[PDB]
Each structure stands twice: as structure tokens, then as C-alpha cells.
């Protein structure tokens, strides 16, 4: 999971 | 927004759509190419091809279970492109590049047409 | 094999599937949650959720145009997860995390259940 | 395009  | 994003989600979705295709699960159309038949999901074909997008948004054709491609279309070129639609992988070879590019132009798959043009230009 | 791969293909496919959903094109099922209705594509739901995969591979349920979820399911949690299925983006907030995790457990969306568990553990 |  990432900060888009 | 303040959303988080799962990097592998789109690839995992496509991998699962290809598994459904392999097992012939919920396929809703047959594409006929020079008497070679290919089962697929209309939505995946529309998401990948300007031609299929135009076909399945037509009020009469959206309801067809069989689509016949132009007789000039090569079944192997179509098969390679159908595989690309469901995997992101293109089996481009010296022996098939001309058929693949011609099929991608007909199907309106602009990124495929682009890499074929570049690969042909490198060999000249 | 000796394939080439188009990096953005899977993301572009998912973006187009979400555009079809927005325009209600070729959606083939309604998911009913506490009298809130959500139109979607069965194949995308199956590709994202172990529950929908099990539902639409069942010989009788594969033919249903309406699926009713358990009354304990929260429509907002479902809406957030449906958006995630079609975009890879999860709108996870302090105010919705419990409903989102409960909905993801029911839908069998293991990666979502994982990030909810981790976000909850960080706040304790 | 890349070599996967
Ligand atoms: O090269 C290409 C690939 C491609 C895909 C589509 N598909 C869609 N476009 C927009 N909204 C939904 C969909 Cl399904 C249309 C044109 C082209 N041209
Ligand atoms: O967490 C999850 C997400 C998910 C998706 C599916 N889908 C499929 N699996 C295998 N072949 C085809 C499909 Cl469509 C099954 C289980 C789970 N569990
Ligand atoms: Cl393309
Ligand atoms: Cl997930």
C-alpha cells in the first residue's frame, strides 16, 4: 500500500 | 482525496480476468477470425480496443454473442493481441510483427501499433 | 517466453472498466445492501472478492441479476470497497475503518483486511 | 514497454  | 492505493491491485484484477478466460467462466462473446473462434469477455475487449469499444456501445451490436472480424485479419495476430489484452504481455516476433501491427491497427490498440512501428523502424 | 510488456496496461484496463461502470455500460448485476443498490460487472466483482468469485461460479447464482448482501453489511463500507475494486484506491478513514474491515472480511478481500488490521493496530 |  502507498500514498498515490 | 486522502485514499491509500494497493500497487498490485490492477495487475491482480487482470490476472484473475485471464484465469476466468482460461476456464471459460462468464465469457459472453465469440470473436470469429477466418473460421478460428475466440471466447472472451466483452468488457475486457472494450477496455483494450477502440474497435470493440465502438462495437459493444452500439445499441444493436451490444446484444450479439458472435462478432465476425474482417476476412483480412490473421487468426494468429488476433490470438497474440487477445493474449496481450488479458496479460499486458505481447509475443512480438520477426515472423508475426506485420500481422500483429495490421491487427492492432484494425482493433485500434494504439500502444501496440506504436511499439510495432518502432520495432519495424529499428530493422530497416 | 520472449514477450515485451506494457507497464501501464493493467491500470489502463481498470480505468476503462471504471469508466464503463460510471456510464452504466454492460453492467450485469445489482448488489443490494440495506436497500442501497450498486450496479457492477460480475467479472470485476469476481476478480476482487472471494465471496463474489464463489457466488458467480455457482451454477444457479451465476444467472442472477440481483444479489442481496447480509443485512449487517453497511452500504457506505460496500461503496468504499466497490470503488477500491475499480480503482485500486481505498478511502480509509477513522470514521469508516471498522465498517470497511467488516465488509472486506465478508467479501473476502484479503489485502484490504490486512491494511485495516495494521491501521487499527497503529491507533491502539 | 519493458522486458518483463
Ligand atoms: O488504443 C485504444 C484502446 C482503447 C480503449 C477504449 N476503451 C474505453 N475508452 C473509454 N472509456 C471506456 C472504454 Cl472501455 C477506447 C479506445 C481505445 N483506443
Ligand atoms: O482476497 C481475495 C481476492 C480474491 C479474488 C478471487 N478471484 C479469482 N480467483 C481465482 N481465479 C479467478 C478469480 Cl476471478 C478469489 C479469491 C479472492 N480472495
Ligand atoms: Cl494498446
Ligand atoms: Cl483486496
PDB file of N, CA, C and O in Angstrom, chain C residues 50-118:
ATOM      1  N   UNK C  50     -13.332 -12.906  -2.968  1.00  0.00           N
ATOM      2  CA  UNK C  50     -13.526 -14.345  -2.828  1.00  0.00           C
ATOM      3  C   UNK C  50     -14.994 -14.706  -2.717  1.00  0.00           C
ATOM      4  O   UNK C  50     -15.418 -15.754  -3.222  1.00  0.00           O
ATOM      5  N   UNK C  51     -15.801 -13.819  -2.073  1.00  0.00           N
ATOM      6  CA  UNK C  51     -17.242 -14.073  -1.951  1.00  0.00           C
ATOM      7  C   UNK C  51     -17.927 -14.032  -3.328  1.00  0.00           C
ATOM      8  O   UNK C  51     -18.650 -14.975  -3.674  1.00  0.00           O
ATOM      9  N   UNK C  52     -17.680 -12.968  -4.113  1.00  0.00           N
ATOM     10  CA  UNK C  52     -18.304 -12.871  -5.440  1.00  0.00           C
ATOM     11  C   UNK C  52     -17.788 -13.937  -6.376  1.00  0.00           C
ATOM     12  O   UNK C  52     -18.553 -14.435  -7.192  1.00  0.00           O
ATOM     13  N   UNK C  53     -16.510 -14.328  -6.227  1.00  0.00           N
ATOM     14  CA  UNK C  53     -15.968 -15.420  -7.046  1.00  0.00           C
ATOM     15  C   UNK C  53     -16.800 -16.707  -6.788  1.00  0.00           C
ATOM     16  O   UNK C  53     -17.202 -17.381  -7.738  1.00  0.00           O
ATOM     17  N   UNK C  54     -17.048 -17.032  -5.506  1.00  0.00           N
ATOM     18  CA  UNK C  54     -17.834 -18.196  -5.099  1.00  0.00           C
ATOM     19  C   UNK C  54     -19.286 -18.094  -5.582  1.00  0.00           C
ATOM     20  O   UNK C  54     -19.834 -19.084  -6.054  1.00  0.00           O
ATOM     21  N   UNK C  55     -19.898 -16.899  -5.472  1.00  0.00           N
ATOM     22  CA  UNK C  55     -21.286 -16.652  -5.904  1.00  0.00           C
ATOM     23  C   UNK C  55     -21.461 -16.857  -7.406  1.00  0.00           C
ATOM     24  O   UNK C  55     -22.370 -17.591  -7.820  1.00  0.00           O
ATOM     25  N   UNK C  56     -20.622 -16.198  -8.220  1.00  0.00           N
ATOM     26  CA  UNK C  56     -20.847 -16.243  -9.659  1.00  0.00           C
ATOM     27  C   UNK C  56     -20.256 -17.482 -10.345  1.00  0.00           C
ATOM     28  O   UNK C  56     -20.505 -17.661 -11.532  1.00  0.00           O
ATOM     29  N   UNK C  57     -19.581 -18.384  -9.603  1.00  0.00           N
ATOM     30  CA  UNK C  57     -19.151 -19.669 -10.183  1.00  0.00           C
ATOM     31  C   UNK C  57     -20.169 -20.749  -9.809  1.00  0.00           C
ATOM     32  O   UNK C  57     -20.071 -21.891 -10.271  1.00  0.00           O
ATOM     33  N   UNK C  58     -21.175 -20.375  -9.004  1.00  0.00           N
ATOM     34  CA  UNK C  58     -22.238 -21.314  -8.644  1.00  0.00           C
ATOM     35  C   UNK C  58     -23.170 -21.397  -9.847  1.00  0.00           C
ATOM     36  O   UNK C  58     -23.609 -20.360 -10.334  1.00  0.00           O
ATOM     37  N   UNK C  59     -23.503 -22.630 -10.295  1.00  0.00           N
ATOM     38  CA  UNK C  59     -24.326 -22.898 -11.475  1.00  0.00           C
ATOM     39  C   UNK C  59     -25.706 -22.232 -11.461  1.00  0.00           C
ATOM     40  O   UNK C  59     -26.222 -21.961 -12.546  1.00  0.00           O
ATOM     41  N   UNK C  60     -26.319 -21.988 -10.265  1.00  0.00           N
ATOM     42  CA  UNK C  60     -27.612 -21.294 -10.186  1.00  0.00           C
ATOM     43  C   UNK C  60     -27.449 -19.795 -10.011  1.00  0.00           C
ATOM     44  O   UNK C  60     -28.206 -19.029 -10.597  1.00  0.00           O
ATOM     45  N   UNK C  61     -26.530 -19.368  -9.131  1.00  0.00           N
ATOM     46  CA  UNK C  61     -26.378 -17.949  -8.813  1.00  0.00           C
ATOM     47  C   UNK C  61     -25.704 -17.156  -9.922  1.00  0.00           C
ATOM     48  O   UNK C  61     -25.942 -15.953 -10.009  1.00  0.00           O
ATOM     49  N   UNK C  62     -24.891 -17.820 -10.781  1.00  0.00           N
ATOM     50  CA  UNK C  62     -24.194 -17.158 -11.906  1.00  0.00           C
ATOM     51  C   UNK C  62     -25.184 -16.424 -12.820  1.00  0.00           C
ATOM     52  O   UNK C  62     -24.793 -15.480 -13.512  1.00  0.00           O
ATOM     53  N   UNK C  63     -26.455 -16.890 -12.837  1.00  0.00           N
ATOM     54  CA  UNK C  63     -27.526 -16.358 -13.670  1.00  0.00           C
ATOM     55  C   UNK C  63     -28.411 -15.298 -13.002  1.00  0.00           C
ATOM     56  O   UNK C  63     -29.327 -14.775 -13.645  1.00  0.00           O
ATOM     57  N   UNK C  64     -28.129 -14.951 -11.743  1.00  0.00           N
ATOM     58  CA  UNK C  64     -28.933 -13.953 -11.051  1.00  0.00           C
ATOM     59  C   UNK C  64     -28.498 -12.546 -11.452  1.00  0.00           C
ATOM     60  O   UNK C  64     -27.292 -12.314 -11.613  1.00  0.00           O
ATOM     61  N   UNK C  65     -29.477 -11.621 -11.587  1.00  0.00           N
ATOM     62  CA  UNK C  65     -29.179 -10.225 -11.934  1.00  0.00           C
ATOM     63  C   UNK C  65     -29.205  -9.361 -10.664  1.00  0.00           C
ATOM     64  O   UNK C  65     -28.836  -8.194 -10.705  1.00  0.00           O
ATOM     65  N   UNK C  66     -29.659  -9.938  -9.537  1.00  0.00           N
ATOM     66  CA  UNK C  66     -29.715  -9.246  -8.241  1.00  0.00           C
ATOM     67  C   UNK C  66     -29.109 -10.146  -7.168  1.00  0.00           C
ATOM     68  O   UNK C  66     -29.482 -11.324  -7.067  1.00  0.00           O
ATOM     69  N   UNK C  67     -28.192  -9.583  -6.363  1.00  0.00           N
ATOM     70  CA  UNK C  67     -27.573 -10.266  -5.225  1.00  0.00           C
ATOM     71  C   UNK C  67     -27.832  -9.425  -3.979  1.00  0.00           C
ATOM     72  O   UNK C  67     -27.454  -8.251  -3.938  1.00  0.00           O
ATOM     73  N   UNK C  68     -28.424 -10.037  -2.950  1.00  0.00           N
ATOM     74  CA  UNK C  68     -28.699  -9.350  -1.695  1.00  0.00           C
ATOM     75  C   UNK C  68     -27.637  -9.708  -0.670  1.00  0.00           C
ATOM     76  O   UNK C  68     -27.477 -10.887  -0.323  1.00  0.00           O
ATOM     77  N   UNK C  69     -26.933  -8.700  -0.162  1.00  0.00           N
ATOM     78  CA  UNK C  69     -25.927  -8.942   0.866  1.00  0.00           C
ATOM     79  C   UNK C  69     -26.572  -9.074   2.250  1.00  0.00           C
ATOM     80  O   UNK C  69     -27.720  -8.663   2.453  1.00  0.00           O
ATOM     81  N   UNK C  70     -25.821  -9.645   3.189  1.00  0.00           N
ATOM     82  CA  UNK C  70     -26.259  -9.852   4.577  1.00  0.00           C
ATOM     83  C   UNK C  70     -26.699  -8.492   5.156  1.00  0.00           C
ATOM     84  O   UNK C  70     -26.010  -7.494   4.923  1.00  0.00           O
ATOM     85  N   UNK C  71     -27.855  -8.423   5.851  1.00  0.00           N
ATOM     86  CA  UNK C  71     -28.311  -7.123   6.400  1.00  0.00           C
ATOM     87  C   UNK C  71     -27.343  -6.413   7.336  1.00  0.00           C
ATOM     88  O   UNK C  71     -27.509  -5.218   7.547  1.00  0.00           O
ATOM     89  N   UNK C  72     -26.334  -7.110   7.888  1.00  0.00           N
ATOM     90  CA  UNK C  72     -25.352  -6.461   8.764  1.00  0.00           C
ATOM     91  C   UNK C  72     -24.371  -5.601   7.962  1.00  0.00           C
ATOM     92  O   UNK C  72     -23.657  -4.784   8.549  1.00  0.00           O
ATOM     93  N   UNK C  73     -24.313  -5.795   6.634  1.00  0.00           N
ATOM     94  CA  UNK C  73     -23.375  -5.025   5.808  1.00  0.00           C
ATOM     95  C   UNK C  73     -23.830  -3.588   5.643  1.00  0.00           C
ATOM     96  O   UNK C  73     -24.962  -3.322   5.251  1.00  0.00           O
ATOM     97  N   UNK C  74     -22.899  -2.682   5.898  1.00  0.00           N
ATOM     98  CA  UNK C  74     -23.059  -1.242   5.816  1.00  0.00           C
ATOM     99  C   UNK C  74     -22.925  -0.769   4.357  1.00  0.00           C
ATOM    100  O   UNK C  74     -21.912  -1.065   3.722  1.00  0.00           O
ATOM    101  N   UNK C  75     -23.920  -0.024   3.805  1.00  0.00           N
ATOM    102  CA  UNK C  75     -23.808   0.439   2.406  1.00  0.00           C
ATOM    103  C   UNK C  75     -22.579   1.311   2.131  1.00  0.00           C
ATOM    104  O   UNK C  75     -21.978   1.178   1.062  1.00  0.00           O
ATOM    105  N   UNK C  76     -22.192   2.180   3.082  1.00  0.00           N
ATOM    106  CA  UNK C  76     -21.011   3.032   2.859  1.00  0.00           C
ATOM    107  C   UNK C  76     -19.716   2.189   2.746  1.00  0.00           C
ATOM    108  O   UNK C  76     -18.920   2.422   1.836  1.00  0.00           O
ATOM    109  N   UNK C  77     -19.547   1.206   3.644  1.00  0.00           N
ATOM    110  CA  UNK C  77     -18.410   0.289   3.603  1.00  0.00           C
ATOM    111  C   UNK C  77     -18.379  -0.437   2.266  1.00  0.00           C
ATOM    112  O   UNK C  77     -17.316  -0.567   1.642  1.00  0.00           O
ATOM    113  N   UNK C  78     -19.564  -0.891   1.796  1.00  0.00           N
ATOM    114  CA  UNK C  78     -19.615  -1.565   0.493  1.00  0.00           C
ATOM    115  C   UNK C  78     -19.202  -0.602  -0.616  1.00  0.00           C
ATOM    116  O   UNK C  78     -18.433  -0.981  -1.484  1.00  0.00           O
ATOM    117  N   UNK C  79     -19.756   0.605  -0.617  1.00  0.00           N
ATOM    118  CA  UNK C  79     -19.467   1.620  -1.640  1.00  0.00           C
ATOM    119  C   UNK C  79     -17.945   1.896  -1.734  1.00  0.00           C
ATOM    120  O   UNK C  79     -17.380   1.916  -2.843  1.00  0.00           O
ATOM    121  N   UNK C  80     -17.288   2.042  -0.567  1.00  0.00           N
ATOM    122  CA  UNK C  80     -15.834   2.293  -0.487  1.00  0.00           C
ATOM    123  C   UNK C  80     -15.072   1.113  -1.116  1.00  0.00           C
ATOM    124  O   UNK C  80     -14.109   1.310  -1.877  1.00  0.00           O
ATOM    125  N   UNK C  81     -15.505  -0.102  -0.804  1.00  0.00           N
ATOM    126  CA  UNK C  81     -14.853  -1.289  -1.364  1.00  0.00           C
ATOM    127  C   UNK C  81     -15.110  -1.461  -2.838  1.00  0.00           C
ATOM    128  O   UNK C  81     -14.207  -1.899  -3.547  1.00  0.00           O
ATOM    129  N   UNK C  82     -16.338  -1.124  -3.320  1.00  0.00           N
ATOM    130  CA  UNK C  82     -16.635  -1.206  -4.755  1.00  0.00           C
ATOM    131  C   UNK C  82     -15.744  -0.209  -5.512  1.00  0.00           C
ATOM    132  O   UNK C  82     -15.174  -0.534  -6.560  1.00  0.00           O
ATOM    133  N   UNK C  83     -15.600   1.001  -4.964  1.00  0.00           N
ATOM    134  CA  UNK C  83     -14.710   1.995  -5.542  1.00  0.00           C
ATOM    135  C   UNK C  83     -13.275   1.465  -5.606  1.00  0.00           C
ATOM    136  O   UNK C  83     -12.618   1.622  -6.634  1.00  0.00           O
ATOM    137  N   UNK C  84     -12.794   0.839  -4.522  1.00  0.00           N
ATOM    138  CA  UNK C  84     -11.453   0.228  -4.488  1.00  0.00           C
ATOM    139  C   UNK C  84     -11.304  -0.832  -5.592  1.00  0.00           C
ATOM    140  O   UNK C  84     -10.279  -0.887  -6.284  1.00  0.00           O
ATOM    141  N   UNK C  85     -12.308  -1.705  -5.738  1.00  0.00           N
ATOM    142  CA  UNK C  85     -12.244  -2.743  -6.793  1.00  0.00           C
ATOM    143  C   UNK C  85     -11.947  -2.163  -8.152  1.00  0.00           C
ATOM    144  O   UNK C  85     -11.125  -2.719  -8.877  1.00  0.00           O
ATOM    145  N   UNK C  86     -12.615  -1.048  -8.498  1.00  0.00           N
ATOM    146  CA  UNK C  86     -12.495  -0.431  -9.809  1.00  0.00           C
ATOM    147  C   UNK C  86     -11.397   0.602  -9.930  1.00  0.00           C
ATOM    148  O   UNK C  86     -11.196   1.117 -11.036  1.00  0.00           O
ATOM    149  N   UNK C  87     -10.686   0.928  -8.827  1.00  0.00           N
ATOM    150  CA  UNK C  87      -9.677   1.997  -8.934  1.00  0.00           C
ATOM    151  C   UNK C  87      -8.322   1.703  -8.296  1.00  0.00           C
ATOM    152  O   UNK C  87      -7.396   2.485  -8.527  1.00  0.00           O
ATOM    153  N   UNK C  88      -8.249   0.708  -7.401  1.00  0.00           N
ATOM    154  CA  UNK C  88      -7.071   0.376  -6.549  1.00  0.00           C
ATOM    155  C   UNK C  88      -6.937   1.376  -5.375  1.00  0.00           C
ATOM    156  O   UNK C  88      -6.011   1.233  -4.576  1.00  0.00           O
ATOM    157  N   UNK C  89      -7.855   2.360  -5.277  1.00  0.00           N
ATOM    158  CA  UNK C  89      -7.825   3.411  -4.251  1.00  0.00           C
ATOM    159  C   UNK C  89      -8.818   3.108  -3.148  1.00  0.00           C
ATOM    160  O   UNK C  89     -10.002   2.888  -3.425  1.00  0.00           O
ATOM    161  N   UNK C  90      -8.343   3.126  -1.898  1.00  0.00           N
ATOM    162  CA  UNK C  90      -9.190   2.843  -0.750  1.00  0.00           C
ATOM    163  C   UNK C  90      -9.330   4.074   0.131  1.00  0.00           C
ATOM    164  O   UNK C  90      -8.335   4.577   0.667  1.00  0.00           O
ATOM    165  N   UNK C  91     -10.576   4.559   0.282  1.00  0.00           N
ATOM    166  CA  UNK C  91     -10.872   5.739   1.110  1.00  0.00           C
ATOM    167  C   UNK C  91     -11.037   5.312   2.581  1.00  0.00           C
ATOM    168  O   UNK C  91     -12.156   5.202   3.087  1.00  0.00           O
ATOM    169  N   UNK C  92      -9.919   4.994   3.225  1.00  0.00           N
ATOM    170  CA  UNK C  92      -9.891   4.511   4.606  1.00  0.00           C
ATOM    171  C   UNK C  92      -9.746   5.681   5.555  1.00  0.00           C
ATOM    172  O   UNK C  92      -8.795   6.468   5.438  1.00  0.00           O
ATOM    173  N   UNK C  93     -10.728   5.828   6.470  1.00  0.00           N
ATOM    174  CA  UNK C  93     -10.774   6.935   7.438  1.00  0.00           C
ATOM    175  C   UNK C  93     -11.116   6.421   8.827  1.00  0.00           C
ATOM    176  O   UNK C  93     -11.754   5.366   8.951  1.00  0.00           O
ATOM    177  N   UNK C  94     -10.725   7.171   9.888  1.00  0.00           N
ATOM    178  CA  UNK C  94     -11.052   6.765  11.265  1.00  0.00           C
ATOM    179  C   UNK C  94     -12.554   6.432  11.417  1.00  0.00           C
ATOM    180  O   UNK C  94     -12.906   5.447  12.068  1.00  0.00           O
ATOM    181  N   UNK C  95     -13.405   7.241  10.788  1.00  0.00           N
ATOM    182  CA  UNK C  95     -14.856   7.089  10.857  1.00  0.00           C
ATOM    183  C   UNK C  95     -15.446   5.921  10.084  1.00  0.00           C
ATOM    184  O   UNK C  95     -16.598   5.550  10.321  1.00  0.00           O
ATOM    185  N   UNK C  96     -14.679   5.311   9.164  1.00  0.00           N
ATOM    186  CA  UNK C  96     -15.240   4.197   8.383  1.00  0.00           C
ATOM    187  C   UNK C  96     -14.462   2.877   8.490  1.00  0.00           C
ATOM    188  O   UNK C  96     -14.923   1.864   7.955  1.00  0.00           O
ATOM    189  N   UNK C  97     -13.269   2.893   9.121  1.00  0.00           N
ATOM    190  CA  UNK C  97     -12.364   1.734   9.148  1.00  0.00           C
ATOM    191  C   UNK C  97     -13.018   0.457   9.684  1.00  0.00           C
ATOM    192  O   UNK C  97     -12.804  -0.619   9.106  1.00  0.00           O
ATOM    193  N   UNK C  98     -13.809   0.556  10.764  1.00  0.00           N
ATOM    194  CA  UNK C  98     -14.475  -0.635  11.292  1.00  0.00           C
ATOM    195  C   UNK C  98     -15.456  -1.242  10.295  1.00  0.00           C
ATOM    196  O   UNK C  98     -15.430  -2.459  10.115  1.00  0.00           O
ATOM    197  N   UNK C  99     -16.297  -0.405   9.626  1.00  0.00           N
ATOM    198  CA  UNK C  99     -17.280  -0.885   8.632  1.00  0.00           C
ATOM    199  C   UNK C  99     -16.537  -1.440   7.417  1.00  0.00           C
ATOM    200  O   UNK C  99     -16.897  -2.503   6.909  1.00  0.00           O
ATOM    201  N   UNK C 100     -15.489  -0.722   6.967  1.00  0.00           N
ATOM    202  CA  UNK C 100     -14.688  -1.180   5.815  1.00  0.00           C
ATOM    203  C   UNK C 100     -14.056  -2.552   6.094  1.00  0.00           C
ATOM    204  O   UNK C 100     -14.165  -3.434   5.231  1.00  0.00           O
ATOM    205  N   UNK C 101     -13.416  -2.741   7.271  1.00  0.00           N
ATOM    206  CA  UNK C 101     -12.791  -4.030   7.592  1.00  0.00           C
ATOM    207  C   UNK C 101     -13.823  -5.153   7.656  1.00  0.00           C
ATOM    208  O   UNK C 101     -13.573  -6.234   7.120  1.00  0.00           O
ATOM    209  N   UNK C 102     -14.962  -4.909   8.329  1.00  0.00           N
ATOM    210  CA  UNK C 102     -16.053  -5.912   8.443  1.00  0.00           C
ATOM    211  C   UNK C 102     -16.581  -6.300   7.049  1.00  0.00           C
ATOM    212  O   UNK C 102     -16.769  -7.497   6.768  1.00  0.00           O
ATOM    213  N   UNK C 103     -16.765  -5.299   6.161  1.00  0.00           N
ATOM    214  CA  UNK C 103     -17.228  -5.553   4.791  1.00  0.00           C
ATOM    215  C   UNK C 103     -16.168  -6.343   4.003  1.00  0.00           C
ATOM    216  O   UNK C 103     -16.527  -7.298   3.314  1.00  0.00           O
ATOM    217  N   UNK C 104     -14.870  -5.972   4.131  1.00  0.00           N
ATOM    218  CA  UNK C 104     -13.782  -6.671   3.425  1.00  0.00           C
ATOM    219  C   UNK C 104     -13.650  -8.117   3.917  1.00  0.00           C
ATOM    220  O   UNK C 104     -13.382  -9.012   3.110  1.00  0.00           O
ATOM    221  N   UNK C 105     -13.887  -8.371   5.220  1.00  0.00           N
ATOM    222  CA  UNK C 105     -13.838  -9.754   5.724  1.00  0.00           C
ATOM    223  C   UNK C 105     -14.958 -10.602   5.102  1.00  0.00           C
ATOM    224  O   UNK C 105     -14.710 -11.710   4.612  1.00  0.00           O
ATOM    225  N   UNK C 106     -16.162 -10.040   5.054  1.00  0.00           N
ATOM    226  CA  UNK C 106     -17.344 -10.683   4.464  1.00  0.00           C
ATOM    227  C   UNK C 106     -17.127 -10.930   2.944  1.00  0.00           C
ATOM    228  O   UNK C 106     -17.416 -12.022   2.440  1.00  0.00           O
ATOM    229  N   UNK C 107     -16.603  -9.922   2.226  1.00  0.00           N
ATOM    230  CA  UNK C 107     -16.368 -10.031   0.789  1.00  0.00           C
ATOM    231  C   UNK C 107     -15.139 -10.880   0.467  1.00  0.00           C
ATOM    232  O   UNK C 107     -14.936 -11.211  -0.696  1.00  0.00           O
ATOM    233  N   UNK C 108     -14.292 -11.181   1.481  1.00  0.00           N
ATOM    234  CA  UNK C 108     -13.053 -11.958   1.298  1.00  0.00           C
ATOM    235  C   UNK C 108     -12.091 -11.196   0.364  1.00  0.00           C
ATOM    236  O   UNK C 108     -11.775 -11.638  -0.750  1.00  0.00           O
ATOM    237  N   UNK C 109     -11.667 -10.018   0.828  1.00  0.00           N
ATOM    238  CA  UNK C 109     -10.728  -9.121   0.120  1.00  0.00           C
ATOM    239  C   UNK C 109      -9.534  -8.999   1.065  1.00  0.00           C
ATOM    240  O   UNK C 109      -9.460  -8.096   1.911  1.00  0.00           O
ATOM    241  N   UNK C 110      -8.677 -10.023   1.017  1.00  0.00           N
ATOM    242  CA  UNK C 110      -7.587 -10.212   1.986  1.00  0.00           C
ATOM    243  C   UNK C 110      -6.613  -9.047   2.118  1.00  0.00           C
ATOM    244  O   UNK C 110      -6.200  -8.766   3.237  1.00  0.00           O
ATOM    245  N   UNK C 111      -6.243  -8.374   1.016  1.00  0.00           N
ATOM    246  CA  UNK C 111      -5.292  -7.262   1.134  1.00  0.00           C
ATOM    247  C   UNK C 111      -5.897  -6.067   1.876  1.00  0.00           C
ATOM    248  O   UNK C 111      -5.204  -5.432   2.672  1.00  0.00           O
ATOM    249  N   UNK C 112      -7.201  -5.795   1.653  1.00  0.00           N
ATOM    250  CA  UNK C 112      -7.914  -4.737   2.378  1.00  0.00           C
ATOM    251  C   UNK C 112      -7.997  -5.073   3.875  1.00  0.00           C
ATOM    252  O   UNK C 112      -7.715  -4.210   4.723  1.00  0.00           O
ATOM    253  N   UNK C 113      -8.374  -6.329   4.209  1.00  0.00           N
ATOM    254  CA  UNK C 113      -8.444  -6.773   5.609  1.00  0.00           C
ATOM    255  C   UNK C 113      -7.080  -6.531   6.294  1.00  0.00           C
ATOM    256  O   UNK C 113      -7.053  -5.938   7.370  1.00  0.00           O
ATOM    257  N   UNK C 114      -5.976  -6.861   5.595  1.00  0.00           N
ATOM    258  CA  UNK C 114      -4.596  -6.655   6.057  1.00  0.00           C
ATOM    259  C   UNK C 114      -4.278  -5.186   6.395  1.00  0.00           C
ATOM    260  O   UNK C 114      -3.842  -4.925   7.516  1.00  0.00           O
ATOM    261  N   UNK C 115      -4.518  -4.229   5.463  1.00  0.00           N
ATOM    262  CA  UNK C 115      -4.217  -2.814   5.757  1.00  0.00           C
ATOM    263  C   UNK C 115      -5.124  -2.229   6.856  1.00  0.00           C
ATOM    264  O   UNK C 115      -4.701  -1.299   7.539  1.00  0.00           O
ATOM    265  N   UNK C 116      -6.368  -2.752   7.008  1.00  0.00           N
ATOM    266  CA  UNK C 116      -7.294  -2.266   8.049  1.00  0.00           C
ATOM    267  C   UNK C 116      -6.775  -2.696   9.404  1.00  0.00           C
ATOM    268  O   UNK C 116      -6.703  -1.871  10.325  1.00  0.00           O
ATOM    269  N   UNK C 117      -6.369  -3.987   9.508  1.00  0.00           N
ATOM    270  CA  UNK C 117      -5.791  -4.570  10.721  1.00  0.00           C
ATOM    271  C   UNK C 117      -4.566  -3.750  11.187  1.00  0.00           C
ATOM    272  O   UNK C 117      -4.464  -3.416  12.374  1.00  0.00           O
ATOM    273  N   UNK C 118      -3.669  -3.407  10.242  1.00  0.00           N
ATOM    274  CA  UNK C 118      -2.447  -2.630  10.503  1.00  0.00           C
ATOM    275  C   UNK C 118      -2.763  -1.201  10.938  1.00  0.00           C
ATOM    276  O   UNK C 118      -2.139  -0.715  11.873  1.00  0.00           O
TER     277      UNK C 118
END
